[PDB]
């Protein structure tokens, strides 16, 4: 409807209505993803509630919205939000696995299928993408990030927004698309010691340099909402951090949508010690520009008094309400509140076979082949497989942050494998035990067969929100099982399922091959069977570093040099940055992964010199020199050798996953704009300095050729 | 000499002499870091400003003599040294001294340290180390007094006072020496405990927690400051103009010699914030570094910088004047040999009085962690199986022991045989447990009645560039403790180490556990007196002992978070917790045991206070046992609501109280309004009205709690 008619609705609402418009509730409070409050809610509140989160189906939505609209004075429908993180009913790989795809289109398609399905079940908004930079795999929520690189995260974040939303300015018309909500603003992933909800602290320069850019990229691509974070940012809970949410989010990032609090985050500023009571919480959150309080009541019980007493301007409340109605209008809810459903059952769009094929393709793009000694893999279709371990038959392959997908529709590893291989003998074991009976049964299966598929992994409940692990290891009984299997003298493939980097040194050393499938989602067992038999060829690269040991954390590829770097020419000298007991290198680095193919790359002649403000054009010719078709991820990194700030030894600035038939050769070009060469300085200005840069072209952060470009002269 | 004659000397120096006055070299050029080709000339070494690392009185005299024969103007060298926790008489490592909670014990260590060092010709000590530490992977935790800014501040002042005494009389008091505060700033926050690694935190947090101990040492009159190896907000400290000009010289009104850490001027290159030695030199001198340690950026580049007009020579004169003013503060222009030349002071080194002082530090600094069922003290006739890698190892002096010698130290066996009549020793290796060790251990335990299991680190596993990713003893030591437990006899573990360690397995496999750290020269007597009860353990933890490596960083002064774990939400899902460990460290800050038992009570406090007013806290303590001992009364404040999320507690006062059996005492603390203040969002030091809780007790966990509402007017 016209902007004038929306603006008129704000004029017409009472104070109590405007207040309750800023409240979101779970469906069970209308006629959980967070702890529950005595909310002292009344009909006056529920009947003017702004939003519902967590509806369980289309029927739930229609029932709630109809009842609500019978009894709402002005005809303002509810907006319905949901956690669709890595799929709705067709579950795709967890986002950390999608990070490892290095494939923007895989990520967009995931989001598009997610939206297709979620809009079918009544959902208008998804609480995705999660754009938190992660350097600490103790934290359970790494599974939700695409990993340790700002650039990759930025790029995949835009891909998710574009997939969920399409053209943002046509969400009133395109009703298989939905609104994206960027979370969690900001820097939540830096939780101290990987402990859930724990203190975050870094300098404002670092926040800008590495922690904000991905939210910013998603905002600038048109993400309709932003969600606040649970953590302090420089000592102030993000939810009532005026500087962060007014100066940065609304000012510098020019964000003009709805700012929804995370679950109880408005009330929690009390626990955090930056508000004495719900009256103070409310005032501070509304001053900071939080528009929508998720499942707490500080606003409804306190805004009136704050405004009547003059401690808060009612203009702040009117702008929140206006952003709330503008959203609803952007989704076309004033002309169709059921958003395509009312007369048109879309159950047919949910869990189609086409969608399953897309999830499966996502799986095989995202898995990461870490070891493959002696061309153990791919296996022949007639290989006789002993399939053993806690992930042989476990249906727990859909991953964390799976609110809507069902395990009964998922494909386990055994089922996946029997579709492809004629001879399979299974011995399932428990996640945390290794009994003598297990060992006898394992030994018999392995004696019968020719190759072992050892299926190891985490339960998904060991990560996600409030799934922090101090030691990033599998249960010891799984390391014992891999050590037992190894004594049996048959080649072993370990297929590892998990949601965070783990200490995998002992697994790599106890097996011939190691494949990291993360949690692929609905099609897990087929993803696994296709990669193992070679129908698909592994093409994923690590988006997060796999530490030598828990105590190496944080370790990441974009790290600073220090004043005493370890060089191969000072090996064994005492006075160098090193540990006494481990290497400085992570066990597996960012951008690392194997293939059944072999590639050669050649970078075209680059200029020695470049002007400031000028783009560097990087041309790369890649050939598949093997007889197996496959995909390689070309990666381009930049380093700034001398700067007014100590800059990282490398930073990814471009990537492209190139598909190549056997013998096939392609050329790809990359533009590194002058923004790629820029950084935040001491005074927090985004700057470009004359000087030397090194450009690295290759297939990991370690397997690269190096080139020198001198930037100076005049400015373009 | 008079200020005018100093100033005049600067006026009379040539440019090359001014440049070279800002160079410090090791004795061999007339090691505590890597060496460069320095391309040094006679003109360089004849005008050098300073020597570090002289190895005796004679070395120094030799060097000053030769040097003074060729220096054109008669400007003597100043000699600096690493005297960190002792010279020849070695005291406990500073982390152990932290656990003393005893200011006076720390001042004496420092006084004895100066007494000895000045005897060997040293004018300056690169002590105190005042880096806040929250990460025990870092080897240099041994050199800090631990995780608390206040305790570090307080003990930091104690050390400055002990080395220096009256700073205005260092030309007169020749048994005292200049202190150099290090490492400015925040070096201890190295990422993942990796040596020299990135440091990053918000400026507010730098002010709130990382800066105050350096500041307290500066205000107490520390004569020098040393730069740190790490970046601070992305810029190597050494060339960090903001840090060194604005904060150090401006806010902290520091007006002495700023010395670089070893090669740190040149290493800004590696850090990537200077292209080359000319850039390094220019930026370090801008930042106000007066003395380049054992690199040559200044020597080879200041001239060209100045002539080219990229640097003003006034910055150089300012650096030179500071150098001369130190020498003059130390009295070198009247006596270049600083009391040595005719008065030989060998007599003052390693005396028995000094030894008794180090033993005393030892018994003040050890921490008794477990003592199940009155195993300790042991009866002097107790028959002891003494086993393990620290049974006989002479490696008990600690890291950062440049000058002390192991032959003069007392090992655990020797200490023990002085007190106990029956001891059977079985020495094992630090990283192995052989079948043969086990047969020999089994037989000694069978013979005796109680096991003294002596476990520990070699000192080379910490100190500078002694980072461990996993904070555990060699697995063979935990195996040994497990084996001993199976033999059925009571076990005391005496643990020797320079860092917090995962000791849950050691506490569970033993009846008593005593943390000696590295006590120094008297280690074996320290151990023997505590075990026999001649001394009663009185140390408390100045650093938290994590449940596991993966808990790090864990510390008592932590923020609440938005979802704190409360007793009334246990095992609920949505609370800050780990799935596999508790939130609490294995042992907390301020924890430790005694063979006595104490009762405390706090007199009535006001419910309200004016802004700017002090809270006066009166505490009556009684020893209610038959055993004389000491307790450390500790007072914490919390700021329940503030414009910045504040820690759940912060230490603001402590006093170690000595009590005979039955004795009772009253001690009063003043908490000034500054103890109620903190750094805000805009980096202002502030006091806000509101509620504070006050906690009085004997650890961060064993406390009574009292509320005070601050507001009203300002005093
Ligand atoms: O369910 C809504 C939200 C709850 N708290 C954590 C968020 O990631 C989630 O979207
Ligand atoms: O030896 C002098 C200096 C060397 N580098 C580290 C410092 O702590 C030390 O005092
Ligand atoms: Mg540069
Ligand atoms: Mg307060």
From TrEMBL, chain B:
<dbReference type="InterPro" id="IPR002772">
    <property type="entry name" value="Glyco_hydro_3_C"/>
</dbReference>
<dbReference type="GO" id="GO:0009251">
    <property type="term" value="P:glucan catabolic process"/>
</dbReference>
<feature type="binding site">
    <location>
        <position position="641"/>
    </location>
    <ligand>
        <name>Mg(2+)</name>
    </ligand>
</feature>
<dbReference type="GO" id="GO:0008422">
    <property type="term" value="F:beta-glucosidase activity"/>
</dbReference>
<dbReference type="InterPro" id="IPR001764">
    <property type="entry name" value="Glyco_hydro_3_N"/>
</dbReference>
<dbReference type="InterPro" id="IPR051915">
    <property type="entry name" value="Cellulose_Degrad_GH3"/>
</dbReference>
<dbReference type="Pfam" id="PF01915">
    <property type="entry name" value="Glyco_hydro_3_C"/>
</dbReference>
<feature type="binding site">
    <location>
        <position position="639"/>
    </location>
    <ligand>
        <name>Mg(2+)</name>
    </ligand>
</feature>
<keyword id="KW-0378">Hydrolase</keyword>
<keyword id="KW-0479">Metal-binding</keyword>
<dbReference type="Pfam" id="PF00933">
    <property type="entry name" value="Glyco_hydro_3"/>
</dbReference>
<dbReference type="InterPro" id="IPR036881">
    <property type="entry name" value="Glyco_hydro_3_C_sf"/>
</dbReference>
<feature type="domain" description="Fibronectin type III-like">
    <location>
        <begin position="631"/>
        <end position="700"/>
    </location>
</feature>
<protein>
    <recommendedName>
        <fullName>beta-glucosidase</fullName>
        <ecNumber>3.2.1.21</ecNumber>
    </recommendedName>
</protein>
<dbReference type="InterPro" id="IPR017853">
    <property type="entry name" value="GH"/>
</dbReference>
<comment type="similarity">
    <text>Belongs to the glycosyl hydrolase 3 family.</text>
</comment>
<dbReference type="InterPro" id="IPR013783">
    <property type="entry name" value="Ig-like_fold"/>
</dbReference>
<dbReference type="InterPro" id="IPR026891">
    <property type="entry name" value="Fn3-like"/>
</dbReference>
<keyword id="KW-0326">Glycosidase</keyword>
<keyword id="KW-0732">Signal</keyword>
<dbReference type="Pfam" id="PF14310">
    <property type="entry name" value="Fn3-like"/>
</dbReference>
<dbReference type="InterPro" id="IPR036962">
    <property type="entry name" value="Glyco_hydro_3_N_sf"/>
</dbReference>
<dbReference type="InterPro" id="IPR019800">
    <property type="entry name" value="Glyco_hydro_3_AS"/>
</dbReference>
<dbReference type="GO" id="GO:0046872">
    <property type="term" value="F:metal ion binding"/>
</dbReference>
């Amino acid at each position: 409807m016209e902007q004038e008619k929306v603006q008129e609705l704000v004029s017409q609402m009472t104070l109590d209505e405007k207040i309750a418009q800023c409240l979101q509730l779970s469906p069970f409070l209308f006629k959980l993803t967070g702890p529950l409050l005595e909310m002292k809610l009344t009909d006056a509140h529920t009947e003017n509630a702004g939003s519902v989160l967590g509806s369980s189906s289309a029927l739930d939505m229609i029932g709630i919205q109809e009842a609500y609209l019978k009894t709402n004075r002005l005809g303002i429908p509810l907006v319905f939000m949901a956690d669709v993180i890595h799929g709705y009913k067709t579950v795709f790989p967890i986002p950390l696995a999608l990070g490892c795809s290095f494939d923007r289109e895989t990520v967009r398609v995931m989001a598009e299928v997610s939206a297709l399905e979620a809009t079918a079940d009544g959902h208008h908004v998804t609480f995705s993408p999660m754009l938190d930079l992660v350097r600490d795999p103790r934290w359970g929520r790494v599974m939700e990030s695409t990993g340790e690189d700002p650039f990759l995260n930025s790029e995949l974040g835009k891909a998710m927004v574009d997939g969920y939303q399409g053209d943002a300015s046509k969400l009133n018309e395109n009703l298989e698309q939905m609104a994206a909500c960027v979370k969690h603003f900001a820097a939540y992933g830096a939780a101290e010691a990987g402990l859930e909800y724990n203190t975050v602290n870094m300098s404002t320069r670092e926040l800008y340099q590495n922690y904000l850019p991905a939210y910013n990229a998603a905002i600038q691509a048109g993400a309709k909402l932003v969600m606040t974070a649970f953590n302090v940012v420089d000592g102030i809970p993000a939810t009532m951090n005026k500087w962060l949410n007014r100066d940065v989010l609304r000012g510098e990032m020019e964000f003009d949508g709805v700012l929804i609090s995370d679950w109880g985050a408005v009330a929690e500023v009390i626990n955090h010690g930056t508000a004495r009571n719900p009256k103070e919480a409310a005032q501070f959150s509304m001053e900071a520009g939080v528009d929508l309080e998720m499942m707490t009541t500080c606003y409804i019980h306190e805004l009136k008094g704050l405004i009547e007493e003059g401690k808060l301007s009612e203009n702040l409340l009117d702008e929140a309400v206006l952003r709330m109605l503008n959203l609803k209008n952007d989704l076309g809810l004033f002309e169709d509140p059921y958003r395509g459903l009312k007369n048109n059952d879309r159950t047919k769009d949910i869990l189609t076979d086409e969608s399953r094929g897309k999830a499966r393709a996502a799986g095989v793009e995202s898995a990461v082949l870490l070891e493959n000694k002696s061309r153990l893999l791919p296996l022949a279709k007639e290989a006789k497989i002993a399939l053993v371990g806690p992930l042989a038959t476990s249906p727990d392959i859909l991953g964390g942050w799976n609110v809507y997908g069902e395990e009964k529709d998922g494909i386990n590893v055994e089922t996946g494998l029997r579709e492809v291989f004629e001879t399979v003998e299974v011995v399932s074991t428990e996640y945390t035990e290794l009994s003598e009976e297990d060992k006898v049964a394992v030994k018999a299966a392995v004696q019968n067969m020719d190759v072992v598929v050892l299926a190891l992994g985490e339960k998904n409940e060991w990560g996600g929100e409030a799934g922090s692990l101090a030691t990033i290891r599998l249960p010891e009984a799984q390391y014992q099982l891999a050590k037992f299997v190894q004594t049996l003298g048959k080649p072993v493939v370990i297929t590892l399922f998990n949601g965070r980097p783990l200490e995998v040194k002992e697994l790599a050393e106890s097996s011939d091959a190691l494949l990291e499938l993360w949690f692929p989602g609905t099609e897990a067992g087929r993803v696994t069977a296709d990669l193992l038999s070679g129908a698909s060829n592994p093409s994923g690269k690590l988006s997060m570093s796999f530490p030598q040991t828990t105590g190496q954390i944080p370790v990441y590829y974009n790290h600073l040099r220090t004043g005493r770097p370890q060089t191969p020419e000072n090996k064994g000298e005492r006075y160098v940055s090193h540990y006494l007991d481990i290497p400085n290198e992570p066990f597996y680095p960012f951008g690392y992964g194997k293939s059944y193919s072999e590639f050669e790359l050649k970078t075209s002649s680059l200029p020695k010199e470049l002007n400031l403000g000028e783009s560097l054009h990087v041309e790369v010719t890649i050939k598949n020199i093997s007889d197996i078709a496959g995909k390689e991820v070309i990666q381009v990194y930049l380093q700034d050798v001398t700067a007014s700030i100590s800059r990282p030894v490398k930073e990814l600035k471009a990537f492209e996953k190139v598909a190549l038939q056997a013998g096939e050769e392609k050329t790809v070009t990359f533009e590194l704009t002058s923004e790629a060469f820029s950084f935040y300085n001491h005074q927090l200005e985004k700057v470009q300095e004359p000087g030397l840069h090194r450009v690295f072209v290759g297939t990991s952060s370690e397997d690269v050729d190096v080139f020198e470009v001198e930037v100076g002269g005049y400015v373009l």
